[PDB]
Design an enzyme around this catalytic site. Structure first.
Site, short mmCIF file in Angstrom:
data_model
loop_
_atom_site.label_atom_id
_atom_site.label_comp_id
_atom_site.label_asym_id
_atom_site.label_seq_id
_atom_site.Cartn_x
_atom_site.Cartn_y
_atom_site.Cartn_z
N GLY A 1 40.39 84.46 39.47
CA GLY A 1 41.60 85.17 39.86
C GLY A 1 41.42 86.67 39.77
N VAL B 1 45.95 91.73 39.79
CA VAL B 1 46.14 92.71 38.71
C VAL B 1 45.68 92.19 37.33
N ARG C 1 39.33 82.32 44.58
CA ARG C 1 39.42 81.45 45.75
C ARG C 1 38.90 82.16 47.00
N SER D 1 50.76 88.62 27.60
CA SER D 1 51.79 89.63 27.80
C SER D 1 51.18 91.02 27.88
N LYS E 1 55.55 81.74 25.50
CA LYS E 1 55.48 82.77 26.53
C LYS E 1 56.72 82.71 27.42
N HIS F 1 59.43 84.32 25.53
CA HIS F 1 59.14 85.75 25.59
C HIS F 1 59.76 86.36 26.86
N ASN F 2 59.60 85.69 27.99
CA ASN F 2 60.15 86.23 29.22
C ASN F 2 61.67 86.12 29.30
N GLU G 1 62.87 89.03 27.45
CA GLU G 1 62.60 90.16 28.32
C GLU G 1 63.63 90.35 29.44
N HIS H 1 87.16 59.45 27.25
CA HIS H 1 85.82 59.66 26.68
C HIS H 1 85.80 59.56 25.17
N1 LIG Z 1 84.86 57.65 32.61
C1 LIG Z 1 85.25 58.43 33.61
O1 LIG Z 1 86.51 59.04 33.59
C2 LIG Z 1 84.34 58.67 34.78
C3 LIG Z 1 84.91 59.11 35.97
C4 LIG Z 1 84.23 58.97 37.17
C5 LIG Z 1 82.98 58.37 37.17
N2 LIG Z 1 82.42 57.93 36.01
C6 LIG Z 1 81.10 57.30 36.07
O2 LIG Z 1 81.22 55.95 36.47
C7 LIG Z 1 80.35 55.14 35.71
C8 LIG Z 1 81.16 54.23 34.81
O3 LIG Z 1 81.82 55.03 33.84
P1 LIG Z 1 82.68 54.37 32.66
O4 LIG Z 1 83.20 55.49 31.82
O5 LIG Z 1 83.59 53.33 33.21
O6 LIG Z 1 81.57 53.61 31.79
P2 LIG Z 1 80.35 54.14 30.90
O7 LIG Z 1 80.80 54.35 29.51
O8 LIG Z 1 79.76 55.37 31.49
O9 LIG Z 1 79.33 52.92 31.02
C9 LIG Z 1 79.63 51.67 30.46
C10 LIG Z 1 79.23 50.59 31.46
O10 LIG Z 1 77.86 50.74 31.73
C11 LIG Z 1 77.19 49.59 31.31
N3 LIG Z 1 75.87 49.90 30.79
C12 LIG Z 1 75.56 50.83 29.84
N4 LIG Z 1 74.22 50.78 29.67
C13 LIG Z 1 73.70 49.84 30.49
C14 LIG Z 1 72.40 49.39 30.71
N5 LIG Z 1 71.39 49.92 30.03
N6 LIG Z 1 72.17 48.38 31.62
C15 LIG Z 1 73.23 47.84 32.32
N7 LIG Z 1 74.51 48.29 32.10
C16 LIG Z 1 74.74 49.27 31.20
C17 LIG Z 1 78.04 48.92 30.25
O11 LIG Z 1 77.68 47.56 30.25
P3 LIG Z 1 77.82 46.75 28.88
O12 LIG Z 1 79.24 46.32 28.70
O13 LIG Z 1 76.90 45.56 28.97
O14 LIG Z 1 77.44 47.60 27.69
C18 LIG Z 1 79.40 49.22 30.84
O15 LIG Z 1 79.73 48.27 31.83
C19 LIG Z 1 79.50 56.08 34.88
O16 LIG Z 1 78.35 56.39 35.62
C20 LIG Z 1 80.33 57.34 34.77
O17 LIG Z 1 79.51 58.48 34.75
C21 LIG Z 1 83.07 58.08 34.81
N1 LIG Z 2 51.40 90.33 36.98
C1 LIG Z 2 51.80 90.35 35.71
O1 LIG Z 2 52.24 91.54 35.11
C2 LIG Z 2 51.79 89.10 34.88
C3 LIG Z 2 51.78 89.24 33.50
C4 LIG Z 2 51.35 88.20 32.69
C5 LIG Z 2 50.94 87.01 33.27
N2 LIG Z 2 50.97 86.86 34.63
C6 LIG Z 2 50.51 85.58 35.20
O2 LIG Z 2 49.09 85.55 35.28
C7 LIG Z 2 48.69 84.97 36.51
C8 LIG Z 2 48.07 86.01 37.42
O3 LIG Z 2 49.03 86.98 37.76
P1 LIG Z 2 48.68 88.18 38.78
O4 LIG Z 2 49.92 88.96 38.96
O5 LIG Z 2 47.40 88.85 38.41
O6 LIG Z 2 48.42 87.42 40.16
P2 LIG Z 2 49.36 86.55 41.12
O7 LIG Z 2 49.91 87.42 42.18
O8 LIG Z 2 50.41 85.79 40.39
O9 LIG Z 2 48.29 85.53 41.75
C9 LIG Z 2 47.28 85.97 42.61
C10 LIG Z 2 45.99 85.25 42.23
O10 LIG Z 2 46.22 83.87 42.34
C11 LIG Z 2 45.38 83.35 43.35
N3 LIG Z 2 46.02 82.27 44.09
C12 LIG Z 2 47.25 82.29 44.67
N4 LIG Z 2 47.44 81.09 45.24
C13 LIG Z 2 46.35 80.31 45.03
C14 LIG Z 2 46.04 79.01 45.40
N5 LIG Z 2 46.91 78.27 46.10
N6 LIG Z 2 44.82 78.48 45.02
C15 LIG Z 2 43.93 79.24 44.29
N7 LIG Z 2 44.25 80.53 43.93
C16 LIG Z 2 45.45 81.05 44.30
C17 LIG Z 2 44.98 84.49 44.27
O11 LIG Z 2 43.78 84.12 44.89
P3 LIG Z 2 43.44 84.70 46.35
O12 LIG Z 2 42.89 86.09 46.23
O13 LIG Z 2 42.39 83.79 46.96
O14 LIG Z 2 44.68 84.77 47.21
C18 LIG Z 2 44.88 85.58 43.22
O15 LIG Z 2 43.64 85.52 42.57
C19 LIG Z 2 49.95 84.43 37.17
O16 LIG Z 2 50.07 83.08 36.81
C20 LIG Z 2 51.06 85.27 36.57
O17 LIG Z 2 52.22 84.51 36.45
C21 LIG Z 2 51.38 87.88 35.44
CL LIG Z 3 54.97 87.95 32.59
#
Ligand SMILES: NC(=O)c1ccc[n+]([C@@H]2O[C@H](COP(=O)([O-])OP(=O)(O)OC[C@H]3O[C@@H](n4cnc5c(N)ncnc54)[C@H](OP(=O)(O)O)[C@@H]3O)[C@@H](O)[C@H]2O)c1
Ligand SMILES: NC(=O)c1ccc[n+]([C@@H]2O[C@H](COP(=O)([O-])OP(=O)(O)OC[C@H]3O[C@@H](n4cnc5c(N)ncnc54)[C@H](OP(=O)(O)O)[C@@H]3O)[C@@H](O)[C@H]2O)c1
Ligand SMILES: [Cl-]
Ligand SMILES: [Cl-]
Ligand SMILES: [Cl-]
Ligand SMILES: [Cl-]
Ligand SMILES: [Cl-]
Ligand SMILES: [Cl-]
Lengths: 482, 482
Positions: free
Chosen positions: A9, A12, A33, A128, A183, A186-187, A190, A452
């Site tokens: 690579g 920079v 590359r 960094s 890292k 870190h960003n 940043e 719920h």
């Molecule tokens: N509650 C709401 O106001 C609300 C509104 C809109 C949509 N929903 C969605 O609609 C769906 C039903 O919601 P709900 O609140 O009525 O019920 P729920 O608490 O989200 O789910 C309970 C139901 O799911 C089944 N179940 C749980 N784990 C299972 C597993 N591993 N394999 C097969 N069945 C399983 C239970 O069967 P068992 O009796 O055998 O345990 C039960 O019939 C959910 O996806 C929910 O996100 C919820």
């Molecule tokens: N720039 C910064 O201040 C900063 C700081 C810390 C870490 N980094 C990280 O360190 C790495 C290098 O950063 P950089 O800014 O120097 O360069 P960059 O712009 O992120 O990448 C350019 C480098 O990657 C190569 N490359 C792009 N696509 C490729 C692909 N599909 N297959 C093989 N090589 C490919 C280019 O090769 P070609 O010449 O063949 O196109 C070139 O050598 C990056 O992952 C970046 O996230 C960047």
């Molecule tokens: Cl960076």
């Protein structure tokens, strides 16, 4: 077998890190590359160095001392997998691949496990410091297969930023994707810091009506106190910077922020694991909003702001308010970041050293701040510290900034200035410090319309459904989260 | 072949929807994983109905008229795939499976494609209205394989909530996962609304010092004007509601909000596709924050709020401010929601009818609002409408609330009341209406430390790297987003 290490690579990061390793006496084999770029590199930037080039992976591998060590610094994603697939058949058991790019931790975990099964030692390491850090001394966050650490420690700590007593800003982070996770976080921090800085700047510009150079000076002064940090530093320089025509460069720049994934990933991880990392969320969304540039131009024609606002106060006093608001919010940024790290250690069983991570950030690091030492101290006194706000240094700082913080935000709101990060940071502080929150109303609503179920304060863990309307059934939903 | 349709899942939604279909004259075959619950249901809630039960899938399928129609109302996730796997062998080409649960749209898209290949027609449909909606008339948002629509239209529109002139709150949404996507957005808006309502309640309680029943009355009154909606309505009821001992129930309820995924999914989708849906993000994180109940008790001991705040203003006037603040923020919530829908249409090629979706929400729906008709009108006037805030009705509303909005937030800030959603909503309004944002500074910083390059206002599309420090190299990073 003349080269100590290879790096793939040549943008920079790759070019600069190569030169850094060269300067520390390591022979490096460069590859890319696009192979033409290898020759261009050796004929220009690497003109007077020990660097050698390869025309193919096969050739590159053949030049390496065993155990062979290869660094990837390419664009994250499929490119990294592409190179791994091609290298594995060329390598021997015990050979080491180090991904230094910004890869998603889940990808790193996967690659680490796959390659381990194949006898190859995989390291995913955050880097960094950007161009400058890569060139002279970056912060390095190595994780993955620790069997590799002993074989890369010398180079890694060798080229890493050194602080104070000469201690390297680079230590083993932990297993599998841990390095890249750290890292990522870190960003996240940043992104948050940058956005807060922008909001301060917006307040200085539009509430206080300050000139470019005046604002540059404010940041420069701020950099001498508690806000002492890399980002504050460069912001001052950016504000000063003049284009070839004598006019300031920043006002010419298009206000549409790019992003390359890490911030987004941090926010997504937070959501997935239920950690309230609100600042990163707003920071990422703020970038998205700026991208809607054309829409914003359109909207600016129809949507009016506060009609009758004029700042009638002491500019100097309010400037200080902004400073303290920025400091407090910056603290929240980091506190959220560490909440996320703690959550990861729990989720994945990584044994993260939070104090240690803080120390790795003291040099060659974008989020270098004067108070990283304080973070280390906090976790030293209490390794189980649940939140940075609970440590005295941080609790006290926030306490002292609180009044200014609220003053800056209230004024910002009155002036119509967007402060997604200042406000979310304050909302978080106010939320986190409250023993009672209105979330009980949310529980009541959910049980009311969706059955719920909820729990009583007096007996947590036992879930109840109430017939709120008086006409409902007895069959409720089950109590579960997802 | 006596039953018109089958439904699997006998929790709140399933039992109630079955009874709804039964009341409309359809013979329904009930089934459940735990088969004992089938008999319990027929012996109790379904005791005087035409509902029939099955003791196995095989038996359930055999009772169905062709093309066979099966509805799934079970916990979203693997359980849905489990039943699909078991059903496919028992079905004939042209048979129809309808997932009515809260499934992730990507799962629905996948199932839809897989089953289509096997000659089975798959519908993924959102169901809104909770217990009461399921029982008497839900909002239904069917999407997936449209070949199924003609075979379920009669039943679906039959049991769906009817509004005004008798039009059903149920129409074909679109291809594959579109139904579940729209349903996801519905829940995003809902989370946002609920959280906003909680913040208004917090202000009434802690700034204005109002009594439960007094606040109950406020919401009841608000429900007569612009804020006319289901959630405002039930909140008033909830506030009045008294437990068997004569004391209000709400203050006894534990302060830790649950969630079952949809809100989280909305926020994640938003991040993934770069849509600034800031309200849902804060709403989801707010629930996360409430869950840290033990931490918050601990933190409340150490972290102090504003020490010297007393509200010294007109209570009635401020209560109105809260109302207007709520209204404006509610508007942002919906505006964001539709930005996400628009984005999905673009991303996936779904031909979504935005006005039509708004109409589907007028009945048997948790986010029923008096202004859904206004949304329809807006998209009628301008199908390409890029944002709700650009429509006159919504532009005007927000303009008239603006003062009160900022007053509410500024006061809330000073009082130390957490307002993650009010503030994010206002931040978003102020951001979106600004032609120039500080994002330019983010671009400058990125280019300064990472060489990410930027564009000039005067020539968008052409990326530049600047040697900010004066000592950097010429090799930059590439310009790309991810
Ligand atoms: N509650 C709401 O106001 C609300 C509104 C809109 C949509 N929903 C969605 O609609 C769906 C039903 O919601 P709900 O609140 O009525 O019920 P729920 O608490 O989200 O789910 C309970 C139901 O799911 C089944 N179940 C749980 N784990 C299972 C597993 N591993 N394999 C097969 N069945 C399983 C239970 O069967 P068992 O009796 O055998 O345990 C039960 O019939 C959910 O996806 C929910 O996100 C919820
Ligand atoms: N720039 C910064 O201040 C900063 C700081 C810390 C870490 N980094 C990280 O360190 C790495 C290098 O950063 P950089 O800014 O120097 O360069 P960059 O712009 O992120 O990448 C350019 C480098 O990657 C190569 N490359 C792009 N696509 C490729 C692909 N599909 N297959 C093989 N090589 C490919 C280019 O090769 P070609 O010449 O063949 O196109 C070139 O050598 C990056 O992952 C970046 O996230 C960047
Ligand atoms: Cl960076
Ligand atoms: Cl070590
Ligand atoms: Cl106009
Ligand atoms: Cl729901
Ligand atoms: Cl039709
Ligand atoms: Cl104490």
């Amino acid at each position: 077998a003349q080269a100590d290490i290879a790096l793939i690579g040549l943008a920079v990061m790759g070019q600069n890190l190569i030169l850094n390793m060269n300067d520390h006496g390591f022979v490096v084999c460069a590859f890319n590359r696009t192979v033409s770029k290898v020759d261009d590199f050796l004929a220009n930037e690497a003109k007077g160095t020990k660097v050698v080039g390869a025309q193919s992976l096969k050739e590159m591998v053949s030049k390496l001392k065993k155990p062979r060590r290869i660094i990837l610094l390419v664009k994250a994603g499929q490119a990294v997998d592409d190179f791994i697939e091609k290298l594995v058949p060329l390598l021997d058991t015990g050979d080491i691949i180090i991904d230094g790019g910004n890869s998603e931790y889940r990808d790193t975990t996967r690659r680490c496990r796959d390659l381990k099964a194949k006898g190859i030692l995989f390291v995913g390491s955050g880097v960094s410091g950007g161009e400058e850090g890569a060139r002279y001394g970056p912060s390095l966050m190595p994780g993955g297969n620790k069997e590799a650490w002993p074989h890369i420690k010398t180079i890694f700590q060798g080229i890493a930023a050194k602080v104070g007593t000469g201690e390297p800003c680079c230590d083993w982070v932990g297993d599998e994707g841990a390095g890249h996770f750290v890292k990522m976080v870190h960003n996240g921090i940043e992104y948050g810091d940058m956005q807060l800085i922008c909001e301060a700047y917006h307040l200085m510009k539009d509430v206080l009506g300050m000139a470019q150079d005046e604002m540059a000076q404010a940041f420069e002064d701020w950099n001498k106190t508690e806000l002492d940090s890399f980002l504050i530093e460069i912001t001052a320089n950016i504000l000063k910077f003049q284009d070839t025509d004598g006019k300031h460069l920043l006002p010419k720049i298009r206000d549409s922020a790019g992003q390359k994934g890490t911030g987004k990933w941090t926010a997504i991880s937070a959501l997935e694991y239920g950690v309230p990392v609100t600042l990163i969320g707003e920071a990422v969304f703020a970038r998205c909003l700026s991208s809607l540039k054309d829409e914003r131009i359109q909207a600016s024609k129809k949507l009016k702001g506060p009609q009758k606002f004029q700042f009638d106060g002491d500019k100097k006093s309010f400037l200080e308010d902004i400073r303290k608001a920025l400091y407090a919010s910056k603290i929240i940024s980091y506190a959220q970041g560490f909440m996320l790290l703690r959550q990861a250690a729990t989720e994945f069983g990584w044994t993260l050293n939070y104090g240690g991570i803080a120390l790795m950030w003291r040099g060659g690091c974008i989020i270098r701040s004067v108070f990283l030492g304080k973070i280390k101290d906090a976790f030293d006194r209490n390794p189980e510290l649940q939140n940075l706000l609970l440590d005295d240094f941080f609790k006290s700082a926030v306490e002292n900034c609180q009044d200014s913080w609220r003053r800056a935000v209230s004024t910002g709101v009155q002036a119509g200035i967007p402060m997604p990060c200042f406000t979310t940071a304050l909302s978080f502080y106010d939320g986190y410090r409250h023993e009672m929150l209105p979330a009980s109303l949310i529980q009541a609503q959910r049980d009311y319309f969706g059955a719920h179920t909820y729990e009583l304060l007096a007996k947590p863990g036992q879930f109840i459904h109430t017939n709120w309307t008086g006409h409902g059934g007895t069959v409720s939903s089950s109590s579960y989260n997802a």
